[PDB]
Design a protein around this ligand. Structure first.
Ligand SMILES: [Mg+2]
Ligand SMILES: [Zn+2]
Ligand SMILES: [Zn+2]
Ligand SMILES: [Zn+2]
Ligand SMILES: [Zn+2]
Ligand SMILES: [Zn+2]
Lengths: 171, 196, 112, 167, 97, 662, 56, 144, 107, 99, 62, 118
């Protein structure tokens, strides 16, 4: 979920960008690979705050490839999920293995062993969705899902969702 | 020629001064590791032989041995030997069912060249056929080749001059070789002078 | 006084054949050999026993035993010596490596 | 300092307030002092990101219903953000589709409401995120609220959040 | 060609640190290996195509650094691991100078 | 092709921490449990799962990926396995340390024999470093034969405080091969101490107890000294070599792990199926011996494990220590690429800082040059020249790391170069190269020269530079090294160059000087009898490269224009140089023409000799390199060598048998 | 043996002479801080001669 | 069945299968013969002992011998410890049979190829149901 | 200061450690016939005060162990009666700079 | 500052011996610009003569000592050097020099 | 994965999901994964637990 | 192989001889800003050393070889090292030098302010 953090990033500035105006180049090259970037250390970083002043240290010239190495300390909003967290979202894809719900920039999977037994798969219906005796869960449908387990790699985060808990599912 | 170098007459080198032959013999043997794990002196073909060397195979014959008299160059194969491998493998991409054999041939040295002097085929004590190929080349003396007198005054050739550049007597005799005076007093080699 | 006599002996050995060496070299030798308060010999049991890094010590002599003692004692190597950077293949903090090159921005933007 | 190896620690969880080693309640900023961990609800995060994007737009330039705001933030991300902004875009559509407060006044009212509760910023941000209507629903949705808040005060918070919720 | 002890000594006497590093790495064996952050060992499973790093036994997927060492140094450290010795490599100082 | 890009941060190793694996750590880091002593499958074509060459450990065939990291040779570092030992065994490198710790600690309750209730123990605790403190503790506690369950008070030896300890009798411990025997005292009871007992005792040792002994609590506990989970090194540690690409000869290490698995399986079957006790000690002694000779084959008082050929098994310690060991043979110094080696020859026509590189060597050694606008045309021309013509290029490295051989690519057409690409072009002239003569006792014996590509097979070099190399052209090899980066090229040119190291820091005097024929000819040239005619004078003047183009006025105008040898030699000496030296019997008039006087780079009197242009302090070389700089001194070396060698060529100098005759 | 004894000793930026551990060997290098290559043998005029020559 | 674990050396630019590949052993490179792009660099062309796993199988055994400083009591102790091993009993008797076969060949000066053929003939036909009751002298004689 | 003649019983050595700050030094008459300080090889040793030692460590940015050492058994150290952690300024004649001032800490 | 004063006192002695008023005004006969040139050059060469920080003087000293060993009553030479470096309690010719 | 015979938990099945958002492709075998038969034996484990414990009650009483 | 009476010393070979004779804080702490000595009280030499000039030339030539913006007028010079020496000649190299003291502290000296006398 949504946090704000003070992060320090190490950036390889190439010697080709040693122009008179490296500050906006450094801020820009911060701003491609952070916006929407996923890190397992802090979650999905979305937007960088305090763009007018960002702490830029005196850069390290690496002794082999000549590139400048800057430890830029910045403040940004992040999306770090956890397990045990219930969130709202919309289903973007479904299958017999389960369905993917979109919570922010994240596609949380709900596995086929994690719905209540009333829901069942019907591939004959277009789009193929999960149908129960009391509700139906299709593509682009509102649903409330709880996350029971999240795995975070160095650059990717995957989560496990369910709707077996009471007061979950479609609102 | 300073400090253990010589200046050798290049015209003398042209006329055969210190020119010499160099024979190298290559011995290769086919052996049976068991029933069918053996190898055969044969000229390999690209259709059915795996892991050949990049040197040319054209100088070989039907028996996988180069005839004597044929000039050889660097990394040319002189003894073509192949052994079968386990069929229907998958290695390096260029592996098919045709490649029933791998190449165990013997190339020449990467720097050596010359003429195949004599090819000798026979059997060993064990009755296995093995070959000996003698390659003859000539080492014309050049810059850097080491020469010694009979007095411990060794050294390399510094440079080679033609006859018109070397000093000469009133009789027109040029030296074949110039040594330096500085080789004499430190070593106290008087017998070199007395021998001269 | 032992250091002075040691320098005198080393100088006598060097100048025995008339060969001349600048004073600071043998001065550095006898200062290293007497820096611990004792005549620390240049042996596998002399300078090779000070806690100067496991990799530096194992590079000289008794390599496997030194690594055994380091593993038993859980010795931490600060990697400031030359030999540790040789084995790690990184820039030794010597000569050109004895500093770091930072990039300036203020004079750079002052240039034009 | 820290004599580091694999020591004993508990796995990350929501009900135990274990948000990891680096999400502590105390946080060290870039200036070095301790500062409270700040977690934002969906509407608060949407407004904060919107102010950040329009501030970036103003910095670049110096050198309501759901549909029109949606296309406004879409063209704002098109003109402000560069490459690989797909995740940020979908985050913006998620934030607009699941927001409960539209203006900064309602968000500030929620913040001043939840600052005096004495609970964690994490759980009050979860409370502002979720449109709960029952105290037992709030207890079974956010397990950290168990034995933390009284049920009548909890119901007051949910009913006043529902009153403050618009559109 | 052997760039042995005494050639290294003369390069040290010149102060030519980066040339010595080049000879020892870019001229013989520059091997890039990944190490865990928790343990200093090189027991990191690296799926570079999948961009997935993890040191199983420390169960961390976010604390992995890559280093450039000689291949002989990696084989040294693996042999010391076979000696039941830990060549724990750390990318930061823990003790003050 | 290089290596695949990695998203992990690239850092440098700042600290190396030592210690011992815990067996739990061994089982944690292990990717497989090795069970079968076989390496190969029963079909003799694939890797046996659970064997010593399990694919999860790694892969040492090019056409085989590692099963764990899914990489080849150049990326997989190899992954460790483990052996679950049937019984604990001793680390053979720690037998003395285990014995010392056992003499320090109780054999029943696992407590220190002497606690802080003794003054000697407390002052032993005052020692800061681990080794000296442990030695003092061991020397103090090796003489204690009882656990001392009750001790007198430290402040007053009148009342008895009951400290920890069971009061039992600690036996004397000695090693007899690979096992420890303990002799209890007789009120001697001697028996062999089992390794599991020692492991239990070491587990019962508290944290502070071995902390006082110098053992760190998470990195090296004394209980971890006993091996009970042996880690399996990956096949990159123990590769399977091939003799003719048909044999499967394995490493000695793999042989030893096969023996380890055989002994371990034998021991667990013997304990599982029931056995007499002596069979159990026999099997565990065999296992311990196999562990030891795996870890150290050279044990004093012990037999050595032998190969099928009968040679001793190369243990890991043998691969570590020694000349061809890992450290001194592969790490602390090593074989390198971009090097060349051939015989050397003198060249009076080369500059002092210049080396003559053979054309084939120059066609072989390459320098990767980065493509800029400043060299796009030159590098494109070198690419079009190809690798078979000097100057040319052998490889083109694209910005993605892809390397294009210039052979096997012209038939694909020419290549358009892009900025930031690398071109591995042949070394042209003036390339800074390291030039080294082994044994290389000192820093002047390996220095940086400039390339001059020459059409023969010898490293050619100036005569004056042979003295610091201690080089003679009687067949000496002498090495070459080419830097591949601009940083190292620059620091080689600016730190290791020949002119910068004219003056030796060894003895604060020049290490290079005018030698041999040039020295003899410069003595013969500066005699007072030596006068040079116009025709030879003009040639001598033109031989100086930096001659200003003005003919000096002759020393003798009439009846014939004659220049003295000093007059022509002073042209090589740059202006502003003032050298003054007085020998014995030397005045301002020199009847012997001894000593020297140079004024404004003009020789006044005195024959030029070893005391002047030799490697001597206060000579011409020292003065010029201190007042004019190193480049001017190198040019002086070249000028003097050229002019003196030319004059000696047209003068001649010999020696004969008559010269030794009185 | 000597090189391995002295392989880690460097003149630092405070002009001290320390090993890898930072232990000071010489507080100033060569007791004078002068590079060895920039040293020449020179005669000290005051120490030699007589007192009359000193005054003259 | 089983993982692939196979690396194919295909040019990612020429895209011709199967590719013409030249192995520059001297230059340490593996290149595409068409475009000249390298595929695998730093190629590998002594330290162990020769052992063909066809004549004696995958037996990996080292015996115990006297070193520079060797005590004899541990030597006999380790020799008898190796003597009572159970898993190599069939291995022990097949090497005993190989030793007797080689002794028979050497006692009648037969060439080494006959020794190899007899040893592999015995190994391929050891432990047969149809060949169990015949005398080991006859087995060796038939193999010879 | 205790000056004996030939030898001491070890039963007195065990009680040479006394109540601090009172300190006992046992000096042999035979070892004290000639002042070793007057020897030409022995340089001038000057004991440093605590503030001097602190300033020396501060200006050279040193730790305690990074100084050159002298043991607490050196004849000059016994002559000055040095204790542990005491630094002496050692001034000796330099053939390159006339006067060289070294420092040694008593261990 | 005390260490800097002590480090140059021999060179200061040499400078005062050479650049005395009697010697300058009698032997050297320098002018104003000549004397200023002399002082500037002496200062410049002295600052150029300072040892550069970062220099491995340990390896330089070790090489400068070990190399003249290769160039080679009381014992002397390589065995004496070995007796010195390997600090042995015994030696070939233990001796005194009593004055 | 039946080809590589390697187990996978629920957490890493999501990162093996394909572009079709239906199947879980193996990393090494590139083959869709099959479901392990664990979890339906939970009642079997409960029956095993009870059938062990009614046979141990005299030991409990002793 | 070969049989040579030409006595070539195989090198790095002293372990024959080893086997012959085998028997015989308070100003600065942690990572604070106190390591960064301020410019007013820097105690290192203002003269840029030979190693410093070598590494500046190497770094600048490496950067110029990868299209760094050259801050001096080129005179037709194309070699990166001579361009770097020209940049150093009129102090146009935008680098500063971090001279580490032995205690871990450091001083920052710009190439512009360092005196290049050698
Ligand atoms: Mg020679
Ligand atoms: Zn780890
Ligand atoms: Zn692998
Ligand atoms: Zn006890
Ligand atoms: Zn291609
Ligand atoms: Zn699979």
């Amino acid at each position: 979920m949504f946090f704000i953090k003070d992060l320090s990033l190490n950036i390889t500035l190439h010697p080709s960008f040693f122009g008179p105006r490296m500050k906006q180049y450094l801020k820009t090259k911060l701003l491609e690979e952070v916006e929407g970037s996923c890190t397992g250390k802090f979650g999905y970083i979305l937007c960088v705050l305090d763009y007018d002043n960002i702490d830029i240290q005196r850069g390290r010239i690496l002794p082999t490839d000549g590139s400048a190495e800057f430890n830029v300390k910045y403040r940004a909003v992040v999306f770090k999920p956890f397990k045990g967290e219930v969130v709202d979202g919309t289903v973007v894809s479904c299958s017999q293995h389960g369905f993917e719900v979109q919570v922010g920039p994240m596609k949380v999977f709900v596995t086929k062993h994690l719905m209540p037994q009333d829901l069942t798969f019907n591939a004959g219906s277009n789009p193929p969705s999960y149908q129960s005796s009391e509700d139906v869960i299709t593509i682009k449908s509102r649903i409330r899902v709880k996350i029971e387990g999240c795995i975070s790699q160095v650059s990717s985060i995957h989560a496990i969702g369910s709707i077996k808990e009471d007061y979950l599912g479609a609102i | 020629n300073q400090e253990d170098s010589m200046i050798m007459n290049q015209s003398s080198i042209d006329r055969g001064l210190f020119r010499s032959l160099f024979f190298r013999s290559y011995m290769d043997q086919e052996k049976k590791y068991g029933m069918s794990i053996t190898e055969t002196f044969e000229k390999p073909q690209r259709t059915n032989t795996l892991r050949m060397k990049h040197g040319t195979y054209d100088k070989l014959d039907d028996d996988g041995l180069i005839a004597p008299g044929v000039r050889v160059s660097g990394e040319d194969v002189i003894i073509g030997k192949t052994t079968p491998i386990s069929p229907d493998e998958e290695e390096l991409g260029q592996r098919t069912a045709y490649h029933s054999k791998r190449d165990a041939s013997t190339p020449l040295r990467s720097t050596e060249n010359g003429i195949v002097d004599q090819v000798l085929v026979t059997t060993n004590q064990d009755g296995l056929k093995f070959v000996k190929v003698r390659v003859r080349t000539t080492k014309i003396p050049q810059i850097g080749d080491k020469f010694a007198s009979r007095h411990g005054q060794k050294g390399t050739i510094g440079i080679t001059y033609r006859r018109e550049d070397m000093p000469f007597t009133a009789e027109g005799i040029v030296p074949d070789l110039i040594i330096n005076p500085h080789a004499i007093p430190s070593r106290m080699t008087v017998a070199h002078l007395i021998e001269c | 006084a032992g250091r002075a006599a040691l320098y005198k002996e080393v100088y006598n050995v060097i100048a025995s054949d008339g060969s001349y060496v600048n004073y600071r070299h043998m001065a550095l030798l006898v200062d290293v050999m007497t820096t611990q308060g004792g005549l620390t010999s240049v042996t596998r049991h002399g300078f090779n026993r000070s806690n100067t890094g496991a990799l530096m010590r194992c590079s000289f002599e008794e390599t496997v035993e030194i690594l055994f003692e380091a593993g038993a004692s859980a010795e931490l190597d600060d990697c400031r010596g030359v030999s540790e950077n040789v084995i790690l293949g990184q820039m030794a903090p010597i000569g050109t490596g004895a500093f770091d090159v930072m990039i300036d921005e203020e004079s750079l933007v002052k240039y034009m | 300092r820290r004599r580091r190896l694999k020591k004993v620690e508990e796995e990350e969880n929501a009900a135990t307030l274990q948000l990891g080693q680096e999400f502590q309640l105390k946080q060290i900023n870039h200036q070095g002092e301790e500062e409270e961990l700040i977690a934002l609800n969906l509407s608060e995060a949407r407004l904060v990101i919107k102010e950040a994007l329009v501030e970036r737009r103003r910095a670049f330039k110096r050198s309501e219903t759901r549909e029109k705001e949606l296309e406004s933030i879409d063209v704002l991300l098109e003109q402000t953000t560069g490459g690989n902004n797909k995740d940020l875009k979908n985050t913006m559509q998620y934030l607009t589709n699941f927001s409960r407060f539209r203006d900064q006044e309602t968000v500030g009212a929620v913040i001043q409401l939840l600052k005096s509760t004495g609970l964690h910023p994490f759980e009050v941000a979860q409370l502002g995120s979720l449109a709960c209507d029952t105290a037992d629903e709030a207890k079974t949705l956010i397990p950290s609220l168990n034995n933390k808040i009284s049920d009548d005060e909890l119901e007051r918070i949910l009913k006043e959040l529902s009153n403050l919720e618009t559109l | 060609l052997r760039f042995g002890e005494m050639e290294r000594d003369c390069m040290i006497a010149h102060g030519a640190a980066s040339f010595l590093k080049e000879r020892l790495m870019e001229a013989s064996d520059a091997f890039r290996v990944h190490i865990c952050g928790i343990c200093g060992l090189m027991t990191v499973i690296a799926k570079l195509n999948h961009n997935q790093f993890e040191c199983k036994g420390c169960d961390n997927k976010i604390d992995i650094y890559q280093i450039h060492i000689p291949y002989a140094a990696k084989l040294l450290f693996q042999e010391l691991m076979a000696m039941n010795i830990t060549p724990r490599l750390y990318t930061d100082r823990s003790r003050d100078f | 092709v290089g290596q695949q890009y990695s998203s992990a941060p690239l850092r440098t190793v700042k600290e190396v921490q030592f210690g011992l694996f815990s067996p739990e750590e061994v089982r944690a880091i292990s990717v497989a449990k090795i069970r079968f002593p076989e390496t190969m499958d029963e079909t003799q074509t694939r890797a046996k799962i659970g064997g010593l060459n399990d694919p999860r450990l790694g892969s040492i065939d090019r056409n085989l990926k590692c099963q764990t990291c899914q990489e080849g040779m150049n990326e997989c570092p190899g992954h460790f396995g483990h052996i679950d030992l049937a019984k604990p065994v001793f680390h053979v490198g720690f037998i003395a340390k285990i014995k010392k710790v056992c003499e320090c600690v109780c054999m029943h309750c696992g407590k220190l024999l002497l606690d802080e209730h003794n003054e000697l123990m407390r002052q032993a605790l005052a020692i800061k470093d681990s080794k000296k403190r442990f030695a003092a503790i061991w020397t103090l506690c090796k003489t204690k034969m009882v656990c001392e369950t009750d001790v007198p008070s430290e402040d007053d030896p009148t009342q008895l405080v009951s400290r920890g300890g069971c009061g039992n009798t600690q036996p004397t411990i000695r090693k007899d091969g690979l096992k420890l025997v303990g002799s209890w005292k007789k009120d001697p009871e001697l028996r062999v101490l089992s390794t599991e007992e020692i492991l239990n005792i070491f587990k019962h040792i508290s944290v502070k107890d071995f902390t006082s002994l110098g053992f760190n609590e998470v990195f090296s506990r004394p209980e971890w000294m006993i091996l009970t989970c042996l880690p399996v090194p990956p096949p990159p540690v123990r590769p399977s070599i091939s003799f003719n690409e048909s044999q499967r000869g394995e490493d000695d290490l793999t042989f030893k792990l096969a023996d380890i698995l055989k002994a371990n399986i034998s021991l667990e079957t013997l304990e599982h199926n029931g056995a007499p006790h002596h069979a159990i000690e026999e099997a565990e002694s065999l296992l311990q011996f196999h562990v030891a000779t795996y870890m150290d084959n050279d044990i004093a008082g012990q037999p050595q494990a032998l190969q099928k050929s009968g040679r001793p098994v190369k243990s890991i310690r043998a691969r570590l220590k020694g000349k061809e060991g890992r450290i001194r043979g592969n790490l602390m110094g090593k074989r390198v690429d971009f090097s060349a080696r051939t015989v050397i020859s003198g060249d009076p026509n080369l500059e002092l800082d210049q080396v003559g590189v053979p054309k084939s060597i120059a066609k072989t050694l390459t320098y990767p040059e980065v493509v800029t606008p400043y060299n796009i045309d030159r590098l494109t021309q070198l690419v079009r020249n190809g690798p078979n013509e000097h100057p040319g290029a052998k490889y083109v490295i694209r910005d993605s790391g892809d390397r294009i051989d210039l052979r096997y690519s012209k038939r694909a057409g020419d290549i358009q170069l892009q900025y930031g690409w690398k071109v591995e072009r042949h070394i042209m002239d003036n390339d800074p190269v390291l030039f080294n003569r082994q044994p290389s006792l000192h820093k002047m014996s390996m220095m940086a020269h400039r390339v001059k590509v020459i059409p023969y097979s010898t490293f050619r070099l100036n005569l004056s530079v042979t003295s610091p190399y201690n080089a003679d052209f009687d067949g000496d090899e002498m090495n070459l090294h080419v830097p591949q980066s601009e940083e190292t090229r620059a620091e080689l040119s600016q730190l290791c160059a020949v002119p910068l190291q004219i003056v030796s820091p060894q003895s604060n005097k020049p290490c290079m000087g005018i030698v041999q024929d040039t020295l003899c000819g410069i003595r013969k040239l500066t005699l007072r009898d030596t006068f040079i005619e116009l025709d030879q004078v003009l040639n001598m003047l033109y031989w100086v490269p930096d001659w200003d183009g003005v003919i000096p006025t002759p020393a003798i105008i009439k009846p014939k224009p004659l220049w003295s040898g000093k007059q022509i030699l002073s042209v090589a000496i740059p202006n502003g140089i003032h050298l003054q030296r007085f020998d014995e019997g030397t005045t301002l008039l020199s009847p012997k023409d001894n000593g020297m006087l140079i004024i404004d780079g003009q020789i006044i009197f005195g024959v030029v000799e070893k005391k002047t242009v030799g490697s001597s302090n206060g000579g011409l070389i020292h003065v010029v390199t201190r007042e004019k700089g190193p480049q001017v001194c190198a040019k002086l070396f070249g000028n003097i060598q050229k002019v003196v060698n030319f004059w000696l060529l047209h003068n001649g100098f010999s020696t004969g048998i008559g010269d030794t005759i009185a | 043996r000597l090189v391995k004894a002295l392989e880690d000793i460097m003149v630092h930026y405070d002009n001290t002479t320390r090993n890898s551990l930072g232990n000071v060997i010489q507080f100033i290098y060569g007791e004078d801080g002068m590079d060895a290559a920039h040293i020449e043998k020179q005669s000290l005029d005051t120490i030699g001669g007589s007192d009359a020559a000193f005054e003259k | 069945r089983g993982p692939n674990l196979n690396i194919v050396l295909t040019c990612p630019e020429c895209k011709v299968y199967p590719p013409k590949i030249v192995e520059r052993f001297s230059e340490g490179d593996v290149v595409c013969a068409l475009c000249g792009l390298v595929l695998s660099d730093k190629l590998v062309d002594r330290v162990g002992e020769a052992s063909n796993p066809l004549l004696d199988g995958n037996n990996l055994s080292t015996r115990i011998g006297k070193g520079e400083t060797t005590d004899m009591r541990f030597t006999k102790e380790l020799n008898k410890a190796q003597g009572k091993n159970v898993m190599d009993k069939k291995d022990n008797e097949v090497q005993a049979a190989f030793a007797k076969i080689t002794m028979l060949c050497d006692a009648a000066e037969l060439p080494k190829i006959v020794k190899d053929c007899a040893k592999e003939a015995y190994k391929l036909c050891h432990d047969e149901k149809t060949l169990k009751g015949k005398s080991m002298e006859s087995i060796m004689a038939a193999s010879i | 200061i205790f000056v004996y003649q030939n030898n001491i019983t070890p039963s007195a050595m065990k009680l040479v450690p006394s109540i601090p700050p009172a300190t006992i030094e046992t000096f042999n008459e035979a070892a004290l016939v000639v002042n070793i300080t007057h020897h030409e090889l022995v340089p001038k040793h000057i004991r440093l005060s605590s503030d001097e030692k602190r300033e020396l460590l501060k200006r050279y940015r040193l730790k305690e162990s990074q100084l050159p050492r002298i043991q607490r058994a050196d004849p000059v150290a016994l002559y000055l009666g040095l204790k542990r952690g005491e630094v002496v300024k050692i001034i000796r004649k330099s053939e390159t700079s006339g006067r060289y001032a070294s420092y040694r800490i008593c261990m | 500052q005390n260490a800097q004063r002590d480090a140059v006192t021999l060179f200061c002695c040499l400078l005062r011996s050479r650049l005395a008023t009697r010697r300058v005004l009698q032997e050297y006969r320098l002018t104003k610009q000549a004397f200023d040139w002399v002082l500037s050059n002496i200062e410049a060469q002295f600052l150029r003569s300072v040892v550069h920080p970062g220099e491995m003087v340990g390896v330089l000293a070790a090489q400068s000592i070990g190399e003249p060993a290769t160039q080679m009553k009381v014992t002397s030479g390589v065995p004496r050097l070995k007796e010195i470096l390997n600090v042995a309690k015994n030696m070939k010719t233990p001796s005194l020099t009593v004055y | 994965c039946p080809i590589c015979l390697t187990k996978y938990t629920q957490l890493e099945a999501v990162q093996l999901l394909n572009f079709d958002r239906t199947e879980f492709l193996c990393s090494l075998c590139d083959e869709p994964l099959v479901e392990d038969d664990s979890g339906k034996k939970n009642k079997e484990k409960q029956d095993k637990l009870n059938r062990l414990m009614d046979q141990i009650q005299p030991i409990i009483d002793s | 192989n070969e049989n040579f009476e030409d006595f070539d010393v195989e090198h790095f070979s002293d372990e024959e001889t080893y086997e012959e004779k085998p028997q015989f804080e308070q100003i600065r702490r942690k990572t604070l800003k106190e390591k960064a000595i301020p410019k007013d009280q820097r105690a290192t030499t203002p003269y840029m050393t030979k190693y410093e000039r070598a590494r500046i030339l190497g770094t600048r030539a490496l950067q110029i070889s990868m299209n760094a913006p050259v801050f001096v007028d080129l005179e037709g010079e194309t070699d990166p090292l001579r361009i770097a020496m020209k940049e150093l000649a009129e102090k146009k190299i935008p680098l500063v030098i971090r001279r580490y003291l032995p205690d871990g502290s450091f001083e920052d000296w710009s190439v512009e302010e360092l005196i290049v006398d050698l």
